[model samples]
Target: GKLVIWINGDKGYNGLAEVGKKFEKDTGIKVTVEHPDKLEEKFPQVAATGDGPDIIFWAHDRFGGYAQSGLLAEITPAAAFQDKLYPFTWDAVRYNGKLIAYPIAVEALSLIYNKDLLPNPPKTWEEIPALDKELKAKGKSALMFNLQEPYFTWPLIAADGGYAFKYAAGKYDIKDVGVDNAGAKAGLTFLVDLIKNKHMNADTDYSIAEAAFNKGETAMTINGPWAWSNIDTSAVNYGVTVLPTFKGQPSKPFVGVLSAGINAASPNKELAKEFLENYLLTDEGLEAVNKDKPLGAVALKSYEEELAKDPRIAATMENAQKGEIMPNIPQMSAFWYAVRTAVINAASGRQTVDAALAAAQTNAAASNINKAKVASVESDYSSIKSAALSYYSDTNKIPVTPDGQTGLNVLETYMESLPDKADIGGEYKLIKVGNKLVLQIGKDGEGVTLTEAQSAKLLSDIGKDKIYTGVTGDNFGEQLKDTTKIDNKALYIVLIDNTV
Candidate 1:
């Protein structure tokens, strides 16, 4: 019998369904896909008894728990036959020496604007509000944000090098979230000020942002490829570009590497991996993922042909050179709800920029505070040191500088924070292990780690430009750097997890 496949959502399921048909035709294998709203409810139940679909398309984060718990199989370092896959996508699915899922799609978030209204989108985050005020002063509609939703705020945070989780070692870590970084605070501060000055509206709904942008009711919206399909760009001219910068820092999105994930429970795992390597890499498959999925590609080769043909696609490609794939750790879920809450607070004028983000960091840490339980009761000081080191490495609690700037100070503070006596309450501490300061988050969080390659991709976006002020033109990062003092020591961040 042919293998049966399953999809978990309504809106995105069809894209997979179309791809499945193509997969079967190209491979001469029989395939069927089952998509139901109840699919999510059913997956775990079925997986528990080992009676799920032969293969299923699922989220990358969930893939971890299932793989670790023995419900999913590990195809790590990938099979020798699977070398053709993109490196970034492979890294997302690889964990603890296992490649449990095959990534099939990739997506990037970029700046999309209504051309008739904006004529030109602001080149940097600093320019957004000034442009908004200028447009409003002229009686044209100004840009607005859905204060209640994190989607409206994520790009800004990411632009400032803020992130929810950091990846280190071979796993994910949740400490020292970029939400607390100086750059992120500056970004959020700017956003809140825009709302206060009437540059953005708290009442602007998601649909309103899109509808208005499409109708020329508003000038611009920071959106991604999903808008390309449904938006009525014909009614007004529209254009796309990579996100702008704040001060001299360029705006960047948490790019998602949408790729194939294999089901470990499937008996046909080898065949599935085989088909994925060839089918997904083929021109047709790349076309389908790029055209219909509205996501970016992990493979650089797949992007060259389309870079010039479409603005949105081109922006995504250009952004990919700088975008950090949102981390894929399970702990990242801890940040989403809390981060959204903080953003809402800032938007509604309930708190100042610093307070909102400060509260957000504490709340984010609280979400995964169970890490203390992982340490021992009568454990020796060495054991305490080990636990703290493990915790710090897995979570990105300790910040790294380009030249190890403030290295000694950072290490001393980190080492001293180790040795958590249960009754003593100081939250997770950063203890020093040798020259490195390690993190020990509460009781249940794992730290995310990044490799040199990942760091390069993220730092490339940050550049060496020091933004003491703002920029005047588009590709503002370029112009900003030209006029400002270049600081190689400025901060940059690598984010590891998001569900999409």
Candidate 2:
């Protein structure tokens, strides 16, 4: 017998190779592990063509899409084995009451506190602002994260009762977008208030937040397992705890459970099941996996002894247990863009939280099958497009000024005369497209104009194309946006106005 497995990030298969070696010896079956590029992007084609590995490990968020597409092999394990894992994990691996993957590790967002600043973490979200007031005297913010990021800010909406879609009888109604619910607004209100009160940073993206925590600029961060490595190396004296209560109770977070899933078309399905159920999930096997990433919050209750050894993992595991499952259906794509725009809209004071969320819910319902792929560009452009092109043709120069704040300040002479168009939720910036620099609309600071040296780099790497991809609405890039279609069929609409 023979088996081939594929994983994404493990250079050494996280010592899984050694376990495979032992499995090979015991069963006289060859177990090969590989790291393949574009694991998610290319999975559909490979799985459909029956060229997929016997087992592929990925997070459970994709389980909904994969299982619905008929790419995953259903799992049937002994009742005793089922009982050995956390019951919460089963929800992540199941699609429509069908087992789609075997749970490996579980994680969720929690409070990572700096021992030097806040020796004891507060027990409620309401208590954070006061801590910020205390820390402000020392020029430190209390808690920092991507305040505009829906993923990080979800607990705010979730604390009361807001959800993306309704899940009933193990199935989700994609058409039922629920983000605008009363509880969702209540949760977001606190977030907005925190921003208004100057507790959380409105501009703190993931990298910024992580950097601040590393430098001990803040007392706490709402983060998870993936951040452990970065924090450990920063030498910050830290401890992990579940998020503080939101409204007299613990706010819910979205749980992420990573699992090993078998391919439906694999020749050795039974063998793959045996290798996982009989060997790789055991204590000896999990220990090797843990060596790849220390303090893994594994789902197997039998591994609780190992997890209890690390308080960090223990706290993360407890949070994961309390958190709700992140919906994995394709329609969840709709909620992501809608809610993200809602957060940005509400936080920027452009719209109230209630109106923003309400608008988002309405958009989500109509676009349940179509995500707004075109990110809106935020600029004081006015009629600046033609102005820049005119300048380039005459003086062969790019406009810049002191008032521009290290960006294209040509807009100083321009005014808002152009007609409004699509929902412009993105900002104008320079981004690298493969080997060339391309102008694209993306996230804040992702492609923002900076110093002359940065501009030199941007122009140095250049390419020309009529059909540019990766223009995004929200964070979804143009390439990914292009991937969405109807019935494996899409009608492309190209509207060009040469007036500019």
Candidate 3:
């Protein structure tokens, strides 16, 4: 039998390839590996086509999306196997009470400090401000991290009382949003104070933060095992330890579980399961898989005996234990964007801490609303479109009402009308160029921007003649029209006027 496994990162691929060789030699099953770029975006599309690999090894957080889409196989591990793995690892892999993946490794951020710069790291998060001033006096930064990144910013949020979703009754409660809560406000305000004091900049991203740490410009940096190789090669002497406590409470980082998932559509399900259970989950296989990566702490309880001996692995495990499991739910998408924006806005002094957090909550609420609306719209269109069309034999004769409840919705009716008037959520005015008509589209608050080809298709699909009449509302279409109306037809470039 043959099996294909798709892994994402180069390190993960190399580590797994070593095990695949042994599995191939012993089991006699041909194991092929592929490193697919943009695994998150590509996996769903490829798996849906029933041409995806038998096994997909990625972070456990993606399990929710894949499992929800029915793209993952629910593997029932032996009770012994369950006992051998970390409890949190199982928690991370389980989606709707089904074991969707085999947890392999755990990742969490720790405070990596320059030993020479700071003989001892700060014991508490509150101590950072005083230390920042002291370090700055010595021409060095106290701490550095991707101020704009929510992943690194989350520890402080968690420390102060911000949680993306409330875990209750063995599941995440999406309705419970606590980012703008009192504790979060306190923690974020502390970060703003650091930014104001020049301890860190809102503009500092991962690269900048890493560079600053490596060059000894910063005393400490918060990062994961993925960054270990770079720091190991760098000249700076660094020490990895658990993050400082905030007001006697530990700073809880999000623990990321990297695991292996079997494809539900795979032909050789039993063979794949056999390979994972008989070979991959064993001590020999786990060792080989993690041999090259010394920093990555294994999730298997069987391998803990060997891994705990190493100081780096021990520290990582300790940190992981004190951390919160990164939620694998789809709602995490909204959390990442909203929290990051709030952090950046507050840090940069673009808005007050309270206002920034309030805006984040508002944005998150809107995103949930938009997601619901999009799903509802898609369902209504897909389920009832044919029946709606049957009632109105002639597409032109369908009555267009204010709410679009009758024959065709605004988008459907607009497309049906063709080249004359195109209403894509809003009305777009088509300006005729030499040969083709350029469809102008934009919106003030909306992020959707159409390309020239998309604009052309909007007309081409219908029939380009007179302007479409549905552009009445002060929505995306009118927003697009008011901004970039140049007298010159030579420049066909549709300029986007408003900030997304």
Which candidate number has the best TM-score? 3
> Which candidate would rank higher by lDDT, 1 or 3?
3
Q: Which portions of model 2 show Cα errors greater than 4 Å?
A: 1-54, 78-80, 146-149, 168-173, 192-199, 247-249, 265-275, 294-297, 327-330, 344-352, 363-500
Q: Scored by CA lDDT, what does every candidate get?
A: 0.55, 0.67, 0.67
Per-residue lDDT over 5-104 for candidate 1, one digit per residue giving the tens place of the 0 to 100 score: 6654322445555666777887777766676555533665586345567666654654554565566656543354455555667777766666777765
> What order do you get sorting by TM-score, best first?
3, 2, 1
> 371-419, model 2: which lDDT tens digit per residue?
2332122122323445545654566544332332333344334433321
lDDT of 3 at 45: 69
Q: Using TM-score as the measure, name the better of candidate 2 and candidate 3.
A: 3
* TM-scores for every candidate against the unseen true structure: 0.61, 0.65, 0.68
Q: Any residue pairs clashing in model 2, and if so which?
A: 375-472, 375-473, 376-424, 376-425, 376-426, 470-478
lDDT of 3 at 71: 91
Rank order (by lDDT, best first): 3, 2, 1
